């Protein structure tokens, strides 16, 4: 049995819980936890806000830990027990489909299969298929690497969509978990990178994060003014915003790509498409190698999550935490046990 | 329970019947009743050990279409089924799990992609492979003409896809043999402009047929000269050296010379040729999984079909030599 912190009901707080997790499948991995970001999904699927959660919950899928057995299938895979390794929002895909078989297991036409539906990291021990399972640099900063798994390549992903580079004026809508690793990220590639944000509080620390300057994200006359002045535009608001004044921030040829899972459809008048040649655009996490090649990228670059450690044992206190908007800038818990 | 092969037992020899055990099938291999198999000119060349790294005895072949007899333990969760008419091409194994496999990029798996004919090809009843290097075949293809696809089809059809060819693109082909006749046909349902660079003035009215919207001979520089800037993409399948200079000229700005022929002798590029005019020279290796099964599907949709003789396989070593004489129009097909 695995020991865990599940959700009994929509929204509930969590309470110890352990589970069954059967037989090890042939391609699987059981992975020990040792720190487990929180994400806003998170705190999604716990309210059920999305519509397709399954109770007892057991959420948590920004996981750092170590190897501790591989399935009949899984040995000659280039993992080890005792290997450290990190698993992300997704842990199973079929990986024979037409999407599996050419480097898109996230768009695995049986469906990847969400870590949490699975049994998810707040917990002792999770399991993921092996292509799931990202193996790790071998300096990455342990402490703070969990989040670069879901919040991580979740920006990244619209970097590579959109063909970033460092000449490339990119901003950044809500500067929380995944906003200022987008803003870390960006600066690492020498990129001209704006901060879109709502909290006065917070533009000191996003600036030294390499914001060139921040815009506060509810003003329009202030988003007025940029008018053309960008390339790519990365939503990670969850709420629904005036989306008009970021679409016309876009220069000809420009991309609104929305991370955030914003409920309240985008009104997109076709002519601020066609006017500018300019695209609305979503992604979702990303693919095993881009994580694989984001940890290094991160690692190397130097680009960690700011982090706000808890205790695995005071969840509740932290998933409280990040709903009152304190996370600074994104909470992550180690495991007891 | 033996698999009954044709093999080289030496360097250039002729094939003899020939029976290997396989050994117990690997978790994730499946086994192929062969069907057909396609003669390729690197058939030739690994029974002749022109590359250097061929071990005897050689099965070859490794254009097979043929239908799922088993399936390893690890290989039954992974869409194929016994019955299943499936294809095997070059490449029959890779690990699954480096950075190039895992992105879709198997052909250059980290560890050294396994060609079929290392690990006995498709000159045989049977013949094994990974189940990722399995390809699955549209419903209304034709299965006798089909083989050639998997190597001599995917091998013209990559550079199209690294190259970023499309219906405007003017696309060359030097030497239409089994690979450059599949390009004629692909770049014609394609909508490109076609030239064909042929050596055999017996071949230009089919290949003009086949979609050529003119045919030029292939080993006369002067005529190569009148074509100065007229292409986005040539591509090379011939094995021999040519006067290659002409047809890097022939390359408009941003243009590509792409060979897939083996060509032994280095090619001679000059740096003034590739910086006037901002041109590149390339190579590749057939194809990744998921591009084969692509193609497999273009292929029959378009109804793009090799050319194909057909031979018994009793008369491998007939069908060989056929080859070997130049005399293919334009791929050697073995049916079991
Ligand atoms: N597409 C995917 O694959 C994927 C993956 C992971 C997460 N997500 C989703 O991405 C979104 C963000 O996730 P997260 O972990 O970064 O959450 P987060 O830490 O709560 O960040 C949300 C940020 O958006 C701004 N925000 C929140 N409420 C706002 C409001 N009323 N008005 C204006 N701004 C507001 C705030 O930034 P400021 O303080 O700077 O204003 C806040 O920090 C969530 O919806 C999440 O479920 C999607
Ligand atoms: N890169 C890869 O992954 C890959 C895959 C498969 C095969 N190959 C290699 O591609 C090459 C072609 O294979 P294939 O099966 O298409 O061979 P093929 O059927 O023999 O075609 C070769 C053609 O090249 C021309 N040719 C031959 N000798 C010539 C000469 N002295 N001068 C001028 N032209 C000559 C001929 O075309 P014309 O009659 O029109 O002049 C001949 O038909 C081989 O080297 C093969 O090993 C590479
Ligand atoms: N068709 C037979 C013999 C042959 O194809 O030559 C097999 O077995
Ligand atoms: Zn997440
Ligand atoms: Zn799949
Ligand atoms: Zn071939
Ligand atoms: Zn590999």
Redesign the pocket.
């Given at each position: 049995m695995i020991k865990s912190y599940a959700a009994k009901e929509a929204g509930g707080e969590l309470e110890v819980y352990e589970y069954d997790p059967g037989e090890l499948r042939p391609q699987d991995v059981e992975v020990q936890v040792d720190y487990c970001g929180i994400?806003?999904?998170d705190l999604?699927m716990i309210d059920n806000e999305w519509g397709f959660s399954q109770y007892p919950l057991v959420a948590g899928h920004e996981v750092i830990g170590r190897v501790v057995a591989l399935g009949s299938a899984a040995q000659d895979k280039g993992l080890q027990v005792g290997q450290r390794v990190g698993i992300g929002?997704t842990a199973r895909s079929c990986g024979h489909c037409d999407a599996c078989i050419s480097g898109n297991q996230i768009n695995c036409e049986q469906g990847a299969v969400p870590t949490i539906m699975n049994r998810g990291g707040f917990a002792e021990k999770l399991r993921a298929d092996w292509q799931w399972v990202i193996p790790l640099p071998e300096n990455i900063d342990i402490e703070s690497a969990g989040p670069l798994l879901?919040?991580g390549i979740?920006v990244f992903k619209p970097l590579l969509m959109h063909h970033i580079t460092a000449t490339s004026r990119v901003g950044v809508i809500?500067?929380?978990?995944?906003?200022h690793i987008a803003i870390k990220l960006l600066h690492a590639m020498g990129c001209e990178v704006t901060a879109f944000?709502?909290?006065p509080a917070?533009e000191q620390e996003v600036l030294a994060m390499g914001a060139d300057k921040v815009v506060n994200?509810?003003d329009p006359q202030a988003l007025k003014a940029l008018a053309g002045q960008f390339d790519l535009i990365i939503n990670?608001?969850?709420?629904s915003?005036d989306w008009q004044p970021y679409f016309e921030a876009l220069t000809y040829g420009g991309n609104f790509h929305t991370?955030?899972?914003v409920l309240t459809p985008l009104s997109v008048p076709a002519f601020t498409l066609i006017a500018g040649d300019r695209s609305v655009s979503?992604?979702?996490?990303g693919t095993p190698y881009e994580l694989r090649k984001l940890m290094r990228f991160a690692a190397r670059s130097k680009v960690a999550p700011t982090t706000e450690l808890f205790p695995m044992s005071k969840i509740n206190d932290a998933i409280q935490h990040?709903r009152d908007?304190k996370?600074r800038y994104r909470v992550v818990l180690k495991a007891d046990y």
């Open positions: 994400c806003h999904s999604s929002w879901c919040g979740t809500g500067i929380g978990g995944l906003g944000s709502s909290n917070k994200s509810r990670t608001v969850n709420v915003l991370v955030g899972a979503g992604s979702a996490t990040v908007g996370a």
